[PDB]
Amino acid sequence: SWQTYVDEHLMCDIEGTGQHLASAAIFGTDGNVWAKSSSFPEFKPDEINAIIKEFSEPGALAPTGLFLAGAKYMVIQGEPGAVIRGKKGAGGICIKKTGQAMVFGIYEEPVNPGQCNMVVERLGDYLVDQGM
Amino acid sequence: PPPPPPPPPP
Numbered sequence: 001s002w003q004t005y006v007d008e009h010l011m012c013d014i015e016g017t018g019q020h021l022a023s024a025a026i027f028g029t030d031g032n033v034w035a036k037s038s039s040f041p042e043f044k045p046d047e048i049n050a051i052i053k054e055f056s057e058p059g060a061l062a063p064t065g066l067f068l069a070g071a072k073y074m075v076i077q078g079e080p081g082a083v084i085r086g087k088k089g090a091g092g093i094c095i096k097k098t099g100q101a102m103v104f105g106i107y108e109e110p111v112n113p114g115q116c117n118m119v120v121e122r123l124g125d126y127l128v129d130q131g132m
Numbered sequence: 133p134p135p136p137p138p139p140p141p142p
Contacts, residue, residue, distance in 0.1 A: 002137055009141070034134040100135060130138035 002026050002035035009123050010105060011037055019111050021119060022091065025104040029055075029097065041069030041106070055081050055097050068093065068106075076113070083121065085113065092116060096124035100132045 010024035025036035031048040047067045054061050058080040066073040066086045073086025073093050084095040090109035094116045095102055105120035107113070 002134060004140065005137055028134060032134070126141050127138065132135065132138065 005123070006035045006037055009126075010103070010119060012119070014111070014115050014119060017111075017115070019115075021105050021111070021116060022108045023104075023106045027102040027104065029100055029102060034101070036104075040104075041071065043069050051084065051095060051102070054084055055102075066093065083117070085117070087113070094120040096120045098124050098127045098132055101127055103127070 005026055006024050011020055013020055023037040023040040025040050026034045027048070028034060029052070031045075031052055047069070050061060050067065054066070058078075061084075062075045066075050066084065071088060073088045076085045076087055078085040082097055086093040092107055092113050094105040094107075094113070101124075103120050103124045105116045107116040
């Protein structure tokens with residue numbers, strides 16, 4: 001099931017490190033959560049709609065910010081329709097869209113935006129190769 | 133519904 005993917009392939013130990021993502025999830029592109037980590041933020045429906053709209057119209061959240069469970073992430077450079085990236089002080093967020101899914105990764109210090117992006121894009125790219 | 137996940141990667 002999808003819970004296995006979050007636990008074993010998102011919340012895994014990051015390479016050459018003891019760290020791991022603060023939380024993670026896998027959503028459908030329709031915005032229904034398929035699986036999430038125990039400490040995944042209590043997101044609101046309109047926050048997910050905004051993320052869905054950002055993959056349809058890139059750069060829409062850039063001036064105003066990306067919100068998750070009330071927490072604002074300063075939007076940073078991302079791949080249009082594919083990856084959304086955000087900064088919240090020390091922490092951040094990486095959202096990777098595939099054919100049928102959206103893979104969320106949320107990190108904290110000392111995890112880099114590149115390492116969250118590695119975990120999230122690696123899994124996203126596997127699900128793309130498997131035809132999803 | 134969520135579609136079935138593919139086989140776990142190596």
